[PDB]
Design a protein around this ligand. Structure first.
Ligand SMILES: CC(C)[C@@H]1c2nn(-c3cccc(S(C)(=O)=O)c3)cc2CN1c1ncc(CO)c(C(F)(F)F)n1
Lengths: 216, 244
């Protein structure tokens, strides 16, 4: 394969109250750049395009990662800082609606499907290779990589879970839900910026010192 | 590999239901404020607004004929239509895009370019994505069955705000996804990416739904007011329309 799932799995494994989420996000951003470098063909792309994809996708990329990490947790999510966030606190802080959607639409569904790490990595690779991210020098190039991920992931699903014919689709149908949830989380992050971290802040603006350095 | 008779018959029903709903909308053509040949602006805005309304009515009649939809409770039916209407409006809009003229055709012969959309009061930040999405859908080369299926799937999205019985909605959605898999794998066996490419348009549509909110924001800024039906749907006329 041109986009082997093996290398995508390696990339996931190779990376192991209101403001606690923001702290965890700042750290995970560093890990994310390393994850993306491990994704087949990502570093072959022009540098400015690598930057564009990571600015466009980091949010959904991280939400998918902490959602899958939280499969064992019950009524909460496990941040990479080791901190656990419970339903009660989320509602206290006025962030309870979006939190319940994350559990209902992401965590729970990933649990009931027993979504595995390869499946996850492929979904995140798809999110990453977004040909609609603004200002790409070559959208086609990125579309083709996304489409290679479609092919590898369907193939993997047929081989490993042959009993489950609709499994490929079930995976892909988490992405709309993830996109809308992404939009709502970004909202909240924008509010925290307007009210009371360096890399995170660099990501929320339109100049990308830290991102440029980290991918060299 | 295969299309069940049941699958074939369901797809036929959806395609038939769209055509039937198109005819109804076309009856309403002489009803629309005519396109002017500062109140020409106000007239174009009124004109566009009226087409949006007819589209919403068309979408409602269509949903009522989607097998399963009527078996849900009335508050879920409403919640699914509230959320999906703009998205389905966009799909139906793309479907009427002609790449040779770069125009969109509403009803029978209401042909509009980008500039026309601007003259009707929409902002560039909204118009551009609409035309980019229409181009993207044209590249896909979808047929009427595919469009109808993708609309059905879109309605039965369990994650919309205020869905009280999501398990029921996901179960309704599943056969429609399964039928679209079978249908596209038979239509173009040599192109295995057609199915996920379609499904991923559902993701695009969540973004476009969000660009639309930004358009509504701009309208308030300009003090343009929307008719009841559209204000309701985008923040009990919907209720009435379902009750008929
Ligand atoms: C362009 C669209 C987003 C939407 C729309 N959809 N159809 C339509 C779609 C399919 C078929 C048919 S038809 C005539 O064949 O039945 C008509 C016609 C229209 C005009 N329009 C629109 N959308 C959002 C807003 C406010 O944000 C406004 C307003 F209010 F600014 F004007 N107008």
């Amino acid at each position: 394969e041109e986009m082997p799932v093996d290398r995508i799995l390696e990339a996931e494994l190779a990376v192991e109250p209101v403001t606690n989420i923001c702290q965890a996000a700042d750290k995970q951003l560093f890990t994310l750049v390393e994850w993306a470098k491990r994704i087949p063909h990502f570093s072959s792309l022009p540098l400015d395009d690598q930057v564009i994809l990571l600015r466009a996708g980091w949010n959904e990329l991280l939400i998918a990662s902490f959602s899958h990490r939280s499969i064992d947790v019950r009524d909460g999510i496990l941040l990479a800082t080791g901190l656990h966030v419970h339903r009660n606190s989320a509602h206290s802080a006025g962030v309870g609606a979006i939190f319940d959607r994350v559990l209902t639409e992401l965590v729970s569904k990933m649990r009931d499907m027993r979504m595995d790490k390869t499946e996850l990595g492929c979904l995140r690779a798809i999110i990453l290779f977004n040909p609609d991210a603004k200002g790409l020098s070559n959208p086609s190039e990125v579309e083709v990589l996304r489409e290679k991920v479609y092919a590898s992931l369907e193939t993997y699903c047929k081989q490993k879970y042959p009993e489950q014919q609709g499994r490929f689709a079930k995976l892909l149908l988490r992405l709309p839900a993830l996109r809308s949830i992404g939009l709502k989380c970004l909202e909240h992050l924008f509010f925290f910026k307007l009210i009371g971290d360096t890399f995170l802040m660099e990501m929320l603006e339109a100049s990308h010192k830290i991102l440029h350095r980290l991918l060299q | 590999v295969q299309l069940t008779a049941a699958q074939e018959l369901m797809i036929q029903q959806l395609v038939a239901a769209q055509l039937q709903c198109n005819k109804r909308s076309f009856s309403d053509q002489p009803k629309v404020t005519p396109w002017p040949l500062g109140s020409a602006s106000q007239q174009r805005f009124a004109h566009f607004t009226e087409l949006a309304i007819i589209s919403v009515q068309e979408i409602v009649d269509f949903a009522k004929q989607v097998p399963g939809f009527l078996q849900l409770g009335r508050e879920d039916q409403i919640a699914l239509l509230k959320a999906s209407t703009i998205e389905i409006m966009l799909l139906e809009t793309a479907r009427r895009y002609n790449h040779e003229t770069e125009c969109i055709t509403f009803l029978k012969d209401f042909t509009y370019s980008k500039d026309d959309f601007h003259r009707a009061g929409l902002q560039v930040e909204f118009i551009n994505p609409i035309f980019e999405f229409s181009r993207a859908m044209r590249r896909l080369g979808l047929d009427d069955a595919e469009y109808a299926l993708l609309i059905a799937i879109n309605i039965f999205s369990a994650d919309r705000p205020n869905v009280q019985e999501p398990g029921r909605v996901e179960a309704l959605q599943q056969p429609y996804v399964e039928a679209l898999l079978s249908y596209t794998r038979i239509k173009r066996p040599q192109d295995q990416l057609r199915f996920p490419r379609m499904l991923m348009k559902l993701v695009s549509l969540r973004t476009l739904s969000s660009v639309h909110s930004e358009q509504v924001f701009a309208l308030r800024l300009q003090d343009k007011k929307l008719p009841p039906l559209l204000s309701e749907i985008w923040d009990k006329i919907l209720h009435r329309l379902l009750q008929d």
